[PDB]
RNA sequence: AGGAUAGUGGCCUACCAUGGUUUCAACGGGUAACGGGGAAUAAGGGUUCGAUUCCGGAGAGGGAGCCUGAGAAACGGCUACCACAUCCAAGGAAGGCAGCAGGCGCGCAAAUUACCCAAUCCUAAUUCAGGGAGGUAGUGACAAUAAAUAACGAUACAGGGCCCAUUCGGGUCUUGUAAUUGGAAUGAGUACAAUGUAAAUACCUUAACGAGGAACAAUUGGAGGGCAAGUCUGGUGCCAGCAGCCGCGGUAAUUCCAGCUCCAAUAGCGUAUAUUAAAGUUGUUGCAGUUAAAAAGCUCGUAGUUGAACUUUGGGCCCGGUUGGCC
């Protein structure tokens, strides 16, 4: 039984059957269709620069209640108008519009984490200087 | 300290079958008048242009610089 | 690619040379000559690695150009001359006569020899034909065109060369029970006696060999090379005499030497 | 839901937090020596042994 | 270009990074031999995994295996030359019984304190690294060097050291000599 | 402090002979020289030293101030990055074109006059950002204000039609407004410490300062 | 059948005939495809990657043509067209960094317009010349190896020693100790000197100097659970923020901001993306299909896969490769 051809010369059916059923994956379908390269703000990248155009007060999801202080960053490499989270306390006073910031993934290969609706990125640097360092006041963001 | 040793039979032959850098090392020979590798590369390049002695153009350009 | 290569960079050289990975980027490419570059040992590696007679390439080169080294009676000032199997070397100083033969381990043994029997060489008949004006000729494996061979000769036989004149002294037919030297495969360098032969027509004949200590095996036919008859090889053999003993007694052979 | 969240509140708690200074404390043997003192503080001066060694036992 | 230079990491990591049963257990060893970290007690365990992997897939093979004694006796020879396994009990079951304190004890700075001159492993390896230890006639300066049981007759203060003789050290120079100006007016 | 102190090395030394260029190993003191590989952190002006004792040389008075204002924007949304990086590139060249934002968010570049602005803008069409830019007159921000003490007390209905809050709007003194912006009166300063210092500094009661 | 080729051949030309491949996937499309040796992971089976140290191919902006030559459809050879661009006296001319350095760009993303043929080799008329091939050094937390950040003296005695553990005023010959007190010990570094080295810079060595806070000062992350470590102090009050997931935050927050303490790995440690294991969540090994997603409405049926049994078995003798306690 077992509903699979166990015959000794059934290798062709086994491979064809397995090769069709591999499409029911999520990772394999993404890799084979190249949905990261085709339909994704990052062209299969990990980080991407951009310009802060405005600031968004992103009201969180339930059961939480908070303003998430995201920034509408448009990515230089493809122009996509994406929203980037701004970690750490303050750090929205540290950045303003028409800055340049380095974005990174948000930890979940898409699928925004936490209580943040529709924001799948977090800002790492700003003005070429780490936002982590700015939060600790080690460096100073140049006015450039 | 552990190294390598080589003894030659004669000073006259010592200058013969010895690598040239040991020659100036032991003071047997003097480091010849030579520029850096880049500059001595450039001079052969600019010498590659002129087809021979190049003196004929040298005296030629002077008369065309006259007027 | 647009023509024959001139650089044979390291990690592409035959492994039996035992070149050093860190000692350089390239390896000495054996120029054209009697031996294919796979089974050939260039002079530079011979005189710098197998002997340490020279520090490096320039010293090997310094030796050859004073015409101090000669191979097969000819000086051959080339640093990368394709010296291969059964190639005799003569040195005016040191009164030293070398010869290039495989040891049991498939690499060229540093087998020294004496002037009297160093004067001659051995070759294997690669093919027998007859050239212009119907003059018969055989070709030894080192490309020694030998005109007017004895009619008893055949292909794959082995002939001894005076090396003073390009003359055959004596020849050996491919007869069973005759010691053969293997020059190919896992049996490379194994001297042993023909057990029998099997044709297996269509190409790539099969040959059966029994080692001196009764270690049987089988190999191709194009990798064998007759050296004579059991007990009378026509050349001296290196230490170990092609016995291909096991992997255990070298523990014994090595510990007994220094560690007792 | 409401979408007009306020930007004028960012950094409030960090801004208004009661400022404190890092205490001046003796420099610590670090490395293998730190492992000795860590081995020691776990097997010589086990201050609180009540049931199980509380590695950070609250003051009480 | 360059022929590649072979290199391979010599340490592994636990699959579970944070286990109370494990962490403290090797901490006992790192607190019994003063390991500067636990990359040491991995690099031994990873080597111990690589060594005992061969036994793991060779105990599958019979006792007439050429390969078995081909490397088994020789590895024990290393173990008895170094000492991690004593001259007796020359069967590879004992190796599978070997615990890393073997290697941890056969570290130099472990042996040096056992033959004193240090009063502590705190001083043993600073004496090693402050240029005051000689394994033979040479200053081996690494605690986890795996002594081959031969420098126990050669280990001592470094002959170049003040403690091995011929030098007074910087501080004894800087104060004994400075007394002359400091003797008064 | 450790501010704006880049520790690098002169990538190459070039002596300016017209438009030509040529490397130089050593250039002695008191000479006109050109240096490369250091501007990418340099802010169009600075001092180079090899010991820590030195303070900075005085800033240049610019002779002429950057008087004219012009607000530049972009024809296409996707073309914002190309110049905004190159708009700093411009400020690196001329020692007086200041580049900043306005209050509504449009970039402002300040030339030294009607002639200077055009020259420093031909490049922004061909040199620094080939994609064309549009010249717009600057928008100046205004503040609204009241000084009438609204008679009808303000009052509103919460969208649930239940709650009610009454309001009245009064002017605030400019000095009070100034001292807010200057940092005298802050949210950081606590309600007790802020209330007293201004209760006498600018005429208000105790309560409103506390409130 | 000829022509062409170095030769074979629809390679081309003429004539002749209707052949060729295909559900065992032809053809067409995609490739974020140069192939392989290999790399990562790895119980086994495998999965993913393989531009990249070797072999092979292709290219020299894109096609195309060709001379020389043994070897080229070459490009650090040429000609033309297309794109770009350079100098200009405007008439013209001269180009190809996917060679080594470097520079305008693109981007998350990548080093010196350094030294030298000293070594490995290669070429040449060829010992000598050349070689950005290669090597040396600079930058380099790609990655990997080893291991500095520190010991000796006793700090209220807050430990079996002891006169049988007594009074812990006695060396309680060993462990813990209030930024208290002194003696050896050096490296990191600096530097004569040799040297390594083509030459040096370094290593290894060494003069001499170089520690008290040894300010020559270790960080990176965490302390609710997963998961090692706080219900400790202060602030905030569903705000700020944290939180990979659950969740914390509404005036007593073990989760926020801090400070202390404690963990963890440690000169490294996090984070992001991708991938392997975990994943027996791709399944041959090895899943599930009554209800959780899933048995085609049912039957026929070609390719496929699979396909009952039966055919010289057995018995003797001989030769000759073994362990054990009858060497
Ligand atoms: C150093 O650079 C400074 C100074 O030059 C000066 O403060 C100058 O003043 C210009 C204005 C400054 C005002 C304040 C900063 C707040 C509002 C700003 C203005 C907008 O309406 C008023 C004047 C003129 C404006 C115009 C320019 C749109 C300002 C501006 O910068 O936007 O601004 C620049 C940025």
Do chain A and chain B touch with ≥3 beta carbon pairs under 8 Å? no
Q: Which residue of C has its CA nearest to E70?
A: C248
Where do the H-state alpha helices sit in E62-107?
Answer: 66-82, 92-96, 101-106
**DSSP summary character for residue C255:** I
Each domain of chain D, given as residue ranges in start order, spans: 1-60
Q: Which nucleotide is the nearest neighbour of E172, by CA and C1'? A: G184
Q: Token pair for residue E105?
A: 């004890």
| C189/C236 Cα distance (integer angstroms) | 14
Question: This structure's resolution (angstroms)?
Answer: 3.0
Q: Token pair for residue C184?
A: 């190919």
A82 Cβ contact list (under 8 Å, min separation 6) = A41, A50, A72, A73, A74, A75, A103, A120, A121
Considering only the beta carbons, identify the residue of E2, E3, E70 that sits closest to C247: E70
| C128/C157 Cα distance (integer angstroms) | 10
| C100/C89 Cα distance (integer angstroms) | 8
Question: Is the Cβ atom of B38 within 7 Å of strand G at any atom?
Answer: yes
Is there a contact between C181 and C202 (Cβ–Cβ < 8 Å)? no
Chain A partners within 8 Å of F43 (Cβ): 144
Question: Is the Cβ atom of A11 within 7 Å of strand G at any atom?
Answer: no
Q: Do D9 and A89 touch (CB under 8 A)?
A: no
| C227/C178 Cα distance (integer angstroms) | 8
Q: Token pair for residue C202?
A: 């269509």
Count how many pairs of residues, chain C against chain E, have C-beta atoms within 8 Å. 15
Look at the block and give the residue holding tokens 């057990």: C195
Atom of ligand 1 nearest to the CA of F140: 21
Count how many pairs of residues, chain A against chain D, have C-beta atoms within 8 Å. 33
Count how many pairs of residues, chain D against chain E, have C-beta atoms within 8 Å. 23
Task: Give me the CATH code for the C174-244 domain, please.
Answer: 2.30.30.30
Taking the stretch 32-71 of protein chain A, residues with Cβ within 7 Å of any atom in nucleic acid chain G are 34, 36-38, 42, 44-50, 60, 63-69
- Surface of C (18-77) touching E: CB under 8 A: 21-22, 25
Is there a contact between F103 and A94 (Cβ–Cβ < 8 Å)? no
Name the residue of F98, F141, F142, F177 whose CB sits within 8 Å of the most ligand 1 atoms, as the mutation to test its pocket: F141
| D51/D41 Cα distance (integer angstroms) | 17
Do chain D and chain E touch with ≥3 beta carbon pairs under 8 Å? yes
| E85/E93 Cα distance (integer angstroms) | 12
| E14/B14 Cα distance (integer angstroms) | 63
What is the full DSSP assignment across D41-55? HHHT-----SSS--S
Q: Which chains touch E (3 or more CB pairs under 8 A)?
A: C, D
| E102/E84 Cα distance (integer angstroms) | 5
Angle between the N-to-C axes of helices E20-33 and E39-56, in degrees from 0 to 180, rounded to the nearest 10:
110
| C110/F104 Cα distance (integer angstroms) | 89
Neighbours of C183 (CB within 10 A): 23
* Architecture of domain F61-143 in this structure: 2-Layer Sandwich (3.30)
| C193/C207 Cα distance (integer angstroms) | 10
Q: Which nucleotide is the nearest neighbour of A49, by CA and C1'? A: G108
| A100/A127 Cα distance (integer angstroms) | 5
Three-state DSSP state, D16: helix
D19 Cβ contact list (under 8 Å, min separation 6) = none
| A58/F8 Cα distance (integer angstroms) | 42
Is there a contact between A69 and D7 (Cβ–Cβ < 8 Å)? yes
Q: What angle do CA C87, C91, C92 make, to 5 degrees?
A: 145
Q: Token pair for residue E32?
A: 């019994």
Question: Is the Cβ atom of D51 within 7 Å of strand G at any atom?
Answer: no
Plot region of F66 (φ>0 → left; ψ -120 to 50 → alpha; else → beta): beta
Q: Within 13 Å of residue A85, how many CA atoms lie on the same side as its CB?
A: 22
Backbone angles phi, psi at A77, to 5 degrees: -75, -30
**DSSP summary character for residue C171:** E
Three-state DSSP state, E108: helix
Distances (CA, A) of C256 to C93, C248, C253: 35, 13, 5
Sheet holding C121-130, edge to edge: C145-147, C136-140, C121-130, C158-161, C168-172
| Interatomic distance A27 CA / G48 C1' (Å) | 12
| A76/A72 Cα distance (integer angstroms) | 13
Task: Give me the CATH code for the C1-116 domain, please.
Answer: 3.10.290.10
Residue whose C-alpha is closest to residue F60's, from F94, F103, F24: F94
Where b means 16+ CB within 10 Å and e means fewer, A74-103 reads bbbeeeeebbbbbebebbbebbeebbbbbb
| C6/C37 Cα distance (integer angstroms) | 12
Is there a contact between E70 and E27 (Cβ–Cβ < 8 Å)? no
| E15/E13 Cα distance (integer angstroms) | 6
The radius of gyration of chain F from alpha carbons, rounded to an integer in Å, stands at 27
Three-state DSSP state, F99: strand
| A133/A140 Cα distance (integer angstroms) | 8
Per-residue 3-state assignment (H helix, E strand, C coil) for chain A: CCCCCCCCCCHHHHHHHHHHHHHHCCHHHHHHHCHHHHCCCCCCCCEEEEEEEEEECCECCCCCCCECCEEEEEECCCCCEEEEECCCCCCCCCCCCCCEEEEEECCCCCCCCCCCCCCCEEEEEECCEEHHHHHCCCCCCCCC
Q: Which nucleotide is the nearest neighbour of E9, by CA and C1'? A: G144
| C204/C120 Cα distance (integer angstroms) | 31
Is there a contact between F129 and F90 (Cβ–Cβ < 8 Å)? no
Three-state DSSP state, C85: coil
- Surface of F (82-121) touching D: CB under 8 A: none
Is there a contact between C158 and C120 (Cβ–Cβ < 8 Å)? no
Residue whose C-alpha is closest to residue E98's, from E82, E122, E121, E110: E82
- In a 10 Å sphere around its CB, with 0-12 CB exposed, 13-18 middle and 19+ buried, how is residue F131 labelled? middle
Is there a contact between A87 and A123 (Cβ–Cβ < 8 Å)? yes
Our CA-based measurement puts residue F79 at a distance from the nearest CA of chain A, in whole angstroms, of 8
Is there a contact between C123 and C69 (Cβ–Cβ < 8 Å)? no
Pairing of strands C8-9, C26-27: antiparallel
Is there a contact between C103 and C97 (Cβ–Cβ < 8 Å)? no
**DSSP summary character for residue F134:** E
Chain C partners within 8 Å of E7 (Cβ): none
Q: Diameter of chain D by CA atoms? A: 59
Does the CB of A129 have a partner CB in chain F at under 8 Å? no
Nucleotides of G under 7 A from a protein CB: 24, 32, 40, 48-49, 53-58, 70-75, 103, 106-109, 112-123, 127-128, 131-135, 143-153, 175-177, 179, 183-188, 196-199, 205-206, 208-211, 213-215, 217-219, 221, 223, 227-232, 234-236, 238-250, 256-267, 271-276, 281-285, 287-289, 295, 304-307
| F83/D31 Cα distance (integer angstroms) | 51
Residue whose C-alpha is closest to residue F14's, from F35, F30, F38: F35
| Interatomic distance A66 CA / G250 C1' (Å) | 13
Ligand 1 centroid – CA F73 distance (Å): 17
Residues with CB under 6 A from ligand 1: F 69, 98, 100, 102-103, 108, 138, 140-141
| E48/E42 Cα distance (integer angstroms) | 9
| C259/D21 Cα distance (integer angstroms) | 69
Q: Do A89 and D13 touch (CB under 8 A)?
A: yes
Neighbours of B32 (CB within 10 A): 7
- In a 10 Å sphere around its CB, with 0-12 CB exposed, 13-18 middle and 19+ buried, how is residue C204 labelled? exposed
Give D31-38 contacts, CB < 8 A, sequence gap 24+.
Answer: D31/E36, D32/E34, D32/E35, D32/E36, D33/E122, D35/E27, D35/E30, D35/E31, D35/E34, D35/E35, D35/E36, D36/E31, D36/E34, D36/E122, D38/E27, D38/E31
| A101/A134 Cα distance (integer angstroms) | 13
| C24/C6 Cα distance (integer angstroms) | 17
| B34/E14 Cα distance (integer angstroms) | 61
Q: Diameter of chain C by CA atoms? A: 67
Is there a contact between C143 and C160 (Cβ–Cβ < 8 Å)? no
Q: Which CATH number fits domain C121-171: 2.30.40.10, 1.10.10.10, 3.40.50.2000, 2.40.50.740?
A: 2.40.50.740
Q: What is the 3-state composition of chain A as percent helix, strand, coil, each rounded to the nearest 5?
A: 20, 25, 55
| C157/C172 Cα distance (integer angstroms) | 6
CATH 2.40.50.740 domain locations along chain C: 121-171
Domain count along chain E: 1
- Surface of D (13-42) touching E: CB under 8 A: 31-33, 35-36, 38-39, 42
Distances (CA, A) of F27 to B4, F10, F18, F40: 45, 12, 17, 22
| F11/F1 Cα distance (integer angstroms) | 26
Atom of ligand 1 nearest to the CA of F138: 28
Pairing of strands C179-181, C41-42: unpaired
Q: Token pair for residue F151?
A: 């008679």
Q: Within 13 Å of residue A71, how many CA atoms lie on the same side as its CB?
A: 28
Residue whose C-alpha is closest to residue E135's, from E162, E107, E175, E170: E107
Backbone angles phi, psi at C146, to 5 degrees: -110, 110
Look at the block and give the residue holding tokens 């502590």: E120
Way it was determined: cryo-EM
Is there a contact between A41 and A78 (Cβ–Cβ < 8 Å)? yes
Considering only the beta carbons, identify the residue of E1, E2, E66 that sits closest to C248: E66
Is there a contact between E161 and E131 (Cβ–Cβ < 8 Å)? yes
Our CA-based measurement puts residue D17 at a distance from the nearest CA of chain F, in whole angstroms, of 9
- Surface of A (78-117) touching F: CB under 8 A: 79, 96-98, 100
Q: Which chains touch F (3 or more CB pairs under 8 A)?
A: A, D
Plot region of C161 (φ>0 → left; ψ -120 to 50 → alpha; else → beta): beta
Q: Which domain holds residue E167?
A: 17-185
CATH 2.30.30.30 domain locations along chain C: 174-244
Does the CB of E39 have a partner CB in chain D at under 8 Å? no
Where do the H-state alpha helices sit in E34-65?
Answer: 39-56
Distances (CA, A) of F109 to A98, C81, E15, F70, F117: 14, 75, 58, 6, 8
Q: Diameter of chain F by CA atoms? A: 83
| F4/A139 Cα distance (integer angstroms) | 10
Is there a contact between F14 and F35 (Cβ–Cβ < 8 Å)? yes
Domain count along chain A: 1
Three-state DSSP state, F62: coil
Q: Which chains touch C (3 or more CB pairs under 8 A)?
A: E
Per the DSSP assignment, residues forming a β-bridge with C146 are C138
| F54/C28 Cα distance (integer angstroms) | 60
Q: Token pair for residue F54?
A: 């030195």
Cis geometry, peptide bond prior to residue A63 (ω within 30 degrees of 0) = yes
Residue whose C-alpha is closest to residue C123's, from C76, C195, C72, C74: C72
Does the CB of F45 have a partner CB in chain A at under 8 Å? no
Distances (CA, A) of A105 to A42, A90, A122, F29: 9, 20, 6, 51
| F114/F67 Cα distance (integer angstroms) | 9
Question: Is the Cβ atom of E130 within 7 Å of strand G at any atom?
Answer: yes
Query: Kind and range of the H or E element at C120?
Result: none
Q: Which residue of C has its CA nearest to E73?
A: C251
Where b means 16+ CB within 10 Å and e means fewer, E8-27 reads eeeeeeeeeeeeeeeeeebb
**DSSP summary character for residue A104:** E
Distances (CA, A) of F198 to D15, F176, F204, F208: 22, 9, 8, 10
Is there a contact between C32 and C81 (Cβ–Cβ < 8 Å)? no
């Amino acid at each position: 039984g077992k509903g699979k051809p166990r015959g000794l010369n059934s290798a062709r059916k086994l491979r064809v059957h397995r090769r069709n059923n591999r499409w029911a994956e999520n990772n394999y379908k993404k890799r084979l269709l190249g949905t990261a390269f085709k339909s994704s703000p990052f062209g299969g990248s990990s980080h991407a620069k951009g310009i802060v155009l405005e600031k968004l007060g992103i009201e969180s999801k339930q059961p939480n209640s908070a303003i998430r202080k995201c920034v509408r960053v448009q990515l230089i490499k493809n122009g996509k108008k994406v929203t980037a989270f701004v970690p750490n306390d303050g750090c929205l006073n540290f950045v303003d519009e028409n800055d340049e910031v380095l974005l990174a993934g948000f930890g979940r290969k898409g699928k925004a984490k936490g209580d943040i609706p529709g924001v799948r990125f977090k800002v790492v640097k700003v003005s070429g200087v780490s936002l982590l360092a700015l939060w600790k006041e080690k460096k100073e963001k140049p006015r450039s | 300290s552990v190294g390598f040793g080589l003894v030659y039979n004669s000073v006259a032959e010592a200058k013969k079958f010895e690598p040239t850098y040991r020659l100036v090392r032991y003071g047997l020979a003097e480091k010849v008048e030579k520029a850096s590798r880049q500059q001595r590369k450039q001079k052969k390049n600019r010498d590659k242009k002129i087809f021979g002695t190049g003196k004929r153009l040298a005296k030629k350009v002077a008369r065309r610089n006259a007027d | 690619a647009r023509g024959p290569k001139k650089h044979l960079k390291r990690l592409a050289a035959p492994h039996h040379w035992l070149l050093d990975k860190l000692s350089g980027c390239y390896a000495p490419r054996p120029s054209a000559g009697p031996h294919k570059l796979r089974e050939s040992l260039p002079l530079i590696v011979f005189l710098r690695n197998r002997l340490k007679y020279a520090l490096n390439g320039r010293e090997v080169k310094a030796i050859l150009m004073q015409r101090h080294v000669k191979v097969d009676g000819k000086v051959r000032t080339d640093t990368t001359y394709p010296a291969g199997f059964m190639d005799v070397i003569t040195l005016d100083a040191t009164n030293e006569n070398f010869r290039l033969v495989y040891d049991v381990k498939g690499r060229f043994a540093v087998h020294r020899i004496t002037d009297e029997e160093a004067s001659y060489k051995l070759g294997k008949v690669k093919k027998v034909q007859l050239g212009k004006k119907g003059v018969p000729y055989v070709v030894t494996h080192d490309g020694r065109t030998i005109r007017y061979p004895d009619p008893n000769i055949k292909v794959n036989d082995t002939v001894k060369i005076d090396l003073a004149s390009g003359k055959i002294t004596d020849f050996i037919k491919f007869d069973a029970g005759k010691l053969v030297y293997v020059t190919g495969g896992r049996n490379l360098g194994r001297i042993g006696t023909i057990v029998h032969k099997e044709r297996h027509d269509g190409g790539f004949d099969l040959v059966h060999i029994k080692d001196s200590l009764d270690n049987t095996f089988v190999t191709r036919l194009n990798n064998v090379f007759v050296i004579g008859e059991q007990g009378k090889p026509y050349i001296s053999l290196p230490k170990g005499k092609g016995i291909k003993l096991s992997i255990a007694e070298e523990r014994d052979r090595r510990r007994a030497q220094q560690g007792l | 839901a409401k979408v007009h969240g306020s930007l004028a509140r960012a950094g409030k708690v960090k801004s208004q937090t009661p400022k404190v200074e890092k205490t001046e404390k003796p420099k610590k043997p670090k490395g293998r020596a730190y492992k000795r003192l860590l081995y020691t503080r776990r097997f010589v001066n086990v201050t609180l042994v009540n049931g199980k060694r509380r590695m950070n036992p609250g003051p009480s | 270009p360059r022929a590649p230079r072979t290199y391979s990491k010599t340490y592994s990591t636990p699959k579970r990074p944070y286990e109370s049963s494990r962490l403290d257990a090797e901490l006992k060893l790192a607190g019994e031999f003063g390991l500067k970290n636990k990359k040491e007690i991995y690099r031994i365990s990873f080597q111990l995994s690589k060594i005992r992997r061969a036994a793991r897939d060779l105990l599958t093979r019979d006792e007439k295996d050429p390969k078995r004694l081909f490397e088994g006796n020789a590895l024990i020879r290393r173990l008895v030359r170094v000492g991690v396994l004593s001259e007796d009990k020359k069967k590879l079951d004992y190796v599978l019984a070997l615990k890393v304190e073997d290697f941890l004890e056969r570290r130099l700075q472990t042996q040096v304190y056992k033959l004193g001159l240090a009063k502590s492993v705190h001083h043993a390896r600073v004496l090693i690294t402050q240029r005051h230890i000689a394994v033979g006639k040479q200053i081996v300066n690494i605690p986890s060097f795996m002594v081959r049981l031969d420098s126990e007759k050669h280990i001592d203060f470094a002959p170049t050291s003040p403690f091995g003789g011929a030098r007074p050290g910087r501080v004894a120079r800087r104060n004994a000599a400075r007394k002359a100006e400091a003797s008064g007016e | 402090k450790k501010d704006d102190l880049f520790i690098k090395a002169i990538q190459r030394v070039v002596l300016m002979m017209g438009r030509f260029v040529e490397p130089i190993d050593d250039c002695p003191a008191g000479n006109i020289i050109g240096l490369v590989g250091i501007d990418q952190f340099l802010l169009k002006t600075g001092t180079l030293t090899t010991s820590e004792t030195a303070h900075n040389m005085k800033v240049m008075k610019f002779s002429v101030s950057p008087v004219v204002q012009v607000a530049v924007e972009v024809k296409n949304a996707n073309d914002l990055p190309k110049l905004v990086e190159g708009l700093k590139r411009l400020s690196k060249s001329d020692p007086c074109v200041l580049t900043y934002m306005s209050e509504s968010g449009e970039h402002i570049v300040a030339g030294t006059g009607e002639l200077h602005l055009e020259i420093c803008l031909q490049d922004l069409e061909h040199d620094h950002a080939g994609v064309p830019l549009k010249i717009s007159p600057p928008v100046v921000a205004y503040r609204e204000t009241v000084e009438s003490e609204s008679s009808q007390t303000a009052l509103s209905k919460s969208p649930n039609k239940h709650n009610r809050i009454y309001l009245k709007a009064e002017p605030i003194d400019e000095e009070v407004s100034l001292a807010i912006e200057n940092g005298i009166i802050n949210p950081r300063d606590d309600f007790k410490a802020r209330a007293r210092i201004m209760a006498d500094d600018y005429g208000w009661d105790v309560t409103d300062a506390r409130k």
